[PDB]
Ligand binder design. Structure first.
Ligand code: GDP
Ligand code: MG
Length: 263
């Protein structure tokens, strides 16, 4: 019943706002200077299904002049959870339920530059997708027009293919034809053009999360405004269990194979 998300990206990309946008979404009838990793856990529920959701907010990388090996604090934390799960699994006397602190999905925030992936993003995504499920998003997508979001999305998809970045949902995990059709529609939308908002607003008799601009409000849970519902339903509803299966059966097993061979 445990599910762990981690937001990863440069500072000023709306990551902390996105953590609050998830934890206060209207899908649920239940309302609820950083320099280290901070995990926020809330045992949420939707329609009679209890879920212990944990979202780990990360400090900003890429803000320094020298950002070489800035991925190691994140890659080190992910491997720590694999190592702790492995040590609990190899004990002679084990716990009846091993606590699952492994990251089941990483949400990587791409700056809305409108150009393409930067060398920093490529190096981070290449090493992240090797050990964890990664779903990239176009951060603060409202800073780009609808036509610019689509063109920027396509160029990123081209960068992911040229640099061999297998992003969730990985095409090598679609067995059923129904999965091949549903996931192909998702990969066409990744990276999601997301917009975050932790502020509520009264919009004609409805309470909604949104960003207040000059000529209206950007309802973040409205598909006609942004693609946050696509990211939200993937993580919480449609692909929650599949993310946990791939984390356990693929990523953790790969870590286990390496550790037991070098031992
Ligand atoms: N245009 C736009 N601005 C946003 C969005 N989300 C957050 N912001 C703004 O970005 C600023 C910093 O956001 P924050 O969540 O702290 O970014 P973080 O450093 O990655 O955690 C805030 O002033 C927010 O108002 C968004 O979806 N669109
Ligand atoms: Mg933040």
């Amino acid at each position: 019943f445990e599910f762990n998300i981690m937001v990863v990206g440069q500072s000023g990309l709306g990551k902390s706002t996105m953590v609050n946008t998830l934890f206060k979404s209207k899908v649920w009838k239940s309302n609820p200077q950083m320099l280290q990793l901070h995990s926020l856990t809330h045992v949420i529920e939707e329609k009679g299904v209890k879920l212990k959701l944990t979202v780990t907010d990360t400090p900003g990388f890429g803000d320094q002049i020298n950002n070489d090996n800035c991925w190691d604090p994140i890659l080190g934390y992910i491997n720590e959870q694999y190592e702790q799960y492995l040590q609990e699994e190899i004990l002679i006397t084990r716990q009846r339920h091993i606590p699952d602190t492994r990251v089941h999905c990483c949400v990587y925030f791409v700056p809305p530059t409108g150009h393409c992936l930067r060398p920093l993003d490529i190096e981070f995504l290449q090493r992240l997708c090797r050990t964890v499920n990664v779903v990239p998003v176009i951060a603060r997508a409202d800073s780009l027009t609808m036509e610019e979001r689509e063109a920027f999305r396509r160029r990123i998809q081209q960068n992911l293919r040229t640099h061999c970045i297998d992003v969730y949902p990985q095409m090598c995990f679609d067995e059923d034809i129904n999965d091949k059709i549903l996931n192909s529609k998702l990969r066409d939308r990744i990276p999601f053009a997301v917009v975050g908002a932790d502020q509520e607003h009264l919009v004609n008799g409805r309470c909604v999360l949104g960003r207040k601009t000059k000529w209206g409000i950007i309802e973040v849970e409205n598909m006609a405004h942004c693609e946050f519902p696509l990211l939200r339903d993937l993580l919480i509803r449609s692909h929650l269990q599949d993310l946990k299966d791939i984390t356990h059966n693929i990523h953790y097993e790969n870590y286990r194979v390496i550790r037991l061979n070098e031992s």
